[PDB]
Ligand SMILES: [K+]
């Protein structure tokens with residue numbers, strides 16, 4: 001049907017073919033029975049007392065064949081109410097949303113969170129006091145406070161551990177390495193498990209939104225971190241080699257070899273500047289100069305992206 | 319012909335002179351035979367059931383005389399389909415594109431890339447283990463593993479080297495310095511060629527998109543890098559001189575002369591802070607204070623640009 005249709009939005013006139021609207025017979029504009037109500041027989045046009053900027057986009061949805069892009073100058077909340085009213089359907093709404101991006105249950109079951117906080121914000125506190133010198137076969141490996149108030153929560157964890165998903169694995173591993181070494185040689189293994197007790201700090205994400213935000217900010221940037229590292233690796237292997245063949249001939253060269261310079265390379269590029277290794281010759285100091293400059297440029301490339309990814313996610317869930 | 323023409327885009331009315339459209343007789347709107355089909359004789363106007371925001375620009379193309387600028391609020395993909403439909407010609411499309419900016423051949427000829435990866439991601443690994451102290455006339459210069467698995471790929475390279483362009487020179491130089499010293503004095507030249515073996519790392523760009531991206535990000539910033547360096551050079555020569563005439567009178571002055579201070583200057587401005595050279599007097603510490611501050615400002619000027627250049631290129635080829 002060529003029969004043209006005129007739609008007047010608060011004074012703004014839009015025209016189109018009736019078949020263009022026929023493409024989505026389930027919508028408001030596509031169903032005779034539904035739009036019938038907005039028809040003005042004195043002017044042969046359908047009239048809606050609604051948002052103007054929004055409609056331009058709605059019409060293109062039918063014209064293009066399904067492209068539902070919100071107009072830059074149209075708020076996200078207003079543009080949605082329109083997609084709603086004009087009834088573009090669910091499958092269309094989602095496709096729109098996509099392209100557009102229990103503690104606190106009541107108070108009682110909520111404060112049950114605080115009893116999980118300290119059980120961490122102190123489980124950490126203890127894990128560190130162990131390494132203290134003022135607190136350090138059955139002794140070479142290994143009752144004792146740093147084993148008392150510890151299990152005082154070790155089973156406290158395994159409790160809610162039954163009361164899958166990432167957020168959950170944060171409690172499994174938060175107790176795994178423990179019963180692992182408990183298991184034999186009555187008289188460096190199991191070492192990989194005491195150092196894995198630290199992960200327990202991640203249990204905080206269950207109450208730290210800012211933290212969990214960073215979580216996705218990462219996976220949603222895997223390709224960025226990679227580039228960052230790849231570049232570094234490049235600048236490093238590259239600069240470590242130059243500084244070497246520039247100091248090679250030295251009765252002082254602080255670079256036994258290239259693999260050694262690596263440490264220097266990283267520390268320089270990241271602008272830390274420890275000093276536990278520096279060029280003494282001129283060639284090396286020239287090489288080093290660039291290494292400092294290139295360091296900035298290098299890092300300052302993939303980073304900005306990752307910066308935005310957080311910029312978003314942070315306010316999105318806000 | 320003054321004869322005015324009325325064009326109605328989905329309800330939006332545009333008017334113009336017929337001669338304005340005559341300027342491009344090869345286009346749709348400029349050819350009678352072509353637009354004839356969209357004419358509405360009851361209203362004396364040509365009607366198109368298409369994108370509204372786009373047309374404003376199309377008309378100006380004829381009005382201005384050839385300026386085809388996409389509207390800020392119009393997606394790049396939509397605006398192109400329009401340039402297409404309205405048939406503005408090829409020479410116009412390119413001029414538009416400009417202002418707007420075999421491994422994986424099938425799988426088999428694709429994995430032929432992995433056999434090039436290790437032949438690098440290990441050619442590097444070896445080039446570094448040479449400098450190792452635990453591995454070091456016919457000996458003063460110079461069979462040996464660091465010559466075994468090396469050529470084990472040296473000719474492996476010269477193979478595809480025949481199986482011009484920048485990306486290619488990455489393999490030429492990736493074997494040049496080798497046969498160069500092979501060539502005489504049976505009993506510091508050729509030194510400039512062992513240090514040129516490192517460039518071999520660049521052979522990675524043939525499989526590192528992120529890397530090659532950085533490639534253009536650079537040439538497309540030559541004017542930036544320059545400014546960066548020029549400024550530094552300025553701040554350096556400038557600050558090295560101040561810190562000197564401020565320490566000159568010292569039984570400790572760590573600055574033999576101005577050319578010496580250079581090292582300090584660079585290290586300070588780039589915020590590395592080695593420590594292998596610092597001001598001891600007050601004048602010097604004042605001078606140094608500014609040197610640190612000015613360092614930030616200096617670098618933080620040309621950089622942002624270069625940042626954007628990558629910001630773009632990165633997502634462009636994405
Ligand atoms: K710094």
Ligand SMILES: [K+]
Pocket residue numbers: 271589
């Ligand atoms: K910094």
Ligand SMILES: [K+]
Pocket residue numbers: 271272273589590591
């Ligand atoms: K520093």
Ligand SMILES: [K+]
Pocket residue numbers: 272273274275590591592593
């Ligand atoms: K430092």
Ligand SMILES: [K+]
Pocket residue numbers: 273274275591592593
């Ligand atoms: K230092």
